[PDB]
Design a protein around this ligand. Structure first.
Ligand SMILES: Nc1ncnc2c1c(I)cn2[C@@H]1O[C@H](CO)[C@@H](O)[C@H]1O
Lengths: 12, 329
């Protein structure tokens, strides 16, 4: 159970 | 010693270390905090040699100090010299972020769920600052930092004013009244342009001057109603055009979002939608929670802000606002 959704996009 | 990096000195004291140059008011670096044991972002700003320099940094320092929000960047610490005379540089220490939206919109694509979520965090955060009767004036994808866990924060409060304009400005996100704009609605336009850019992965209104930006909008928004001096005569001379359907530029986009996008990107500032209203839009029902979303406790009061003062007095104002963070005081 982890809200706020799970994706890290990523690097600059 | 002073932990000099790149070309110039970066004296942040023993508190921060392992400086890494990020890029870019002034130089921006990523240091390691030892007091909180977590990497932070420090930006070196060296003003005091210009009229509008001391204002925007004071304007940004003040506002960010009295604001607290999950979607607005916050100053963790400020470092400078103990005395007025030796104070030439200011170090704004803020929490570190992985990227911003400009770096995001390029090389990467967002799903409708990710687009909706970001626009929400923009609006959720915007409605706080707007609740305090303060204008961001310059909203950009580059001013929207992004946390690793898809959390959005807003920066660049230098050009902020309460509810010279022309001074140093990416003019792709200006409102039709800021062509050459003093209300909440001028920020919505920018946020509208951003949504259009998140939806197309490209700038909705390219070119940063009159022959393009206010000319390309005519290609999409069309000729204005007669509700709408040298900018006046120029538009009337230009041939009549029609509004190209939002479902032609964005055919693979959400029907909900396109409705909101059109409500945000209307020509005239009057009835150009409002915050909270945009939050109530069907496109944002999965996230909208007015019971949790914080608002301003009180409008940004006056008398303390009237920056027609000389640079000499502004430096003094910086000193007072910064003394709250100075280690010994
Ligand atoms: N607080 C922060 N945390 C992490 N990075 C930051 C900041 C700040 I203030 C600025 N930047 C870096 O500067 C770029 C500005 O578009 C950003 O994209 C970013 O590279």
């Amino acid at each position: 159970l982890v809200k706020k959704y799970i994706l890290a996009l990523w690097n600059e | 010693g002073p932990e000099m990096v790149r070309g110039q000195v970066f004296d942040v004291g023993p508190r921060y270390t392992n400086l890494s140059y990020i890029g870019e008011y002034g130089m921006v670096c990523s240091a390691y905090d030892n007091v909180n044991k977590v990497r932070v972002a420090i930006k070196k700003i060296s003003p005091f040699e210009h009229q509008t320099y001391c204002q925007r940094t004071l304007r940004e320092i003040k506002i960010l100090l009295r604001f607290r929000h999950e979607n607005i960047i916050g100053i963790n610490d400020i470092i400078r010299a103990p005395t007025i005379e030796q104070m030439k540089d200011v170090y704004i220490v803020q929490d570190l972020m992985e990227t911003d939206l400009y770096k995001l919109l390029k090389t990467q694509h967002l799903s409708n769920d990710h687009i909706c979520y970001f626009l929400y965090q923009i609006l959720r955060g915007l409605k706080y600052i707007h609740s305090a009767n303060v204008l961001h004036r310059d909203l950009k994808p580059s001013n929207l930092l992004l946390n690793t866990t898809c959390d959005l924060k807003i920066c660049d409060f230098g050009l902020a004013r309460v509810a010279f304009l022309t001074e140093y400005v990416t003019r792709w996100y200006r409102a039709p009244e800021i062509m050459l704009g003093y209300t909440k609605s001028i920020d919505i336009w920018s946020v509208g342009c951003i949504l259009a850019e998140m939806l197309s992965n490209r700038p909705i209104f390219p070119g940063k001057h009159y022959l393009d930006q206010l000319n390309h909008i005519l290609g999409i928004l069309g000729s204005p109603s007669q509700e709408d001096l040298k900018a006046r005569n120029y538009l009337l001379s230009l041939p009549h055009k029609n509004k190209v359907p939002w479902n032609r530029l964005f055919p693979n986009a959400d029907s909900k979002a396109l409705d909101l996008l059109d409500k945000m990107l209307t020509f005239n500032p009057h009835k150009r939608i409002e915050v909270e209203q945009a939050l109530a839009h069907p496109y944002l029902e999965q996230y909208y929670d007015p019971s949790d979303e914080p608002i301003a406790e009180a409008p940004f009061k006056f008398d303390m802000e009237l920056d027609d003062l000389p640079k000499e007095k502004l430096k003094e104002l910086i000193f007072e606002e910064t003394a709250r963070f100075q280690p010994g005081y």
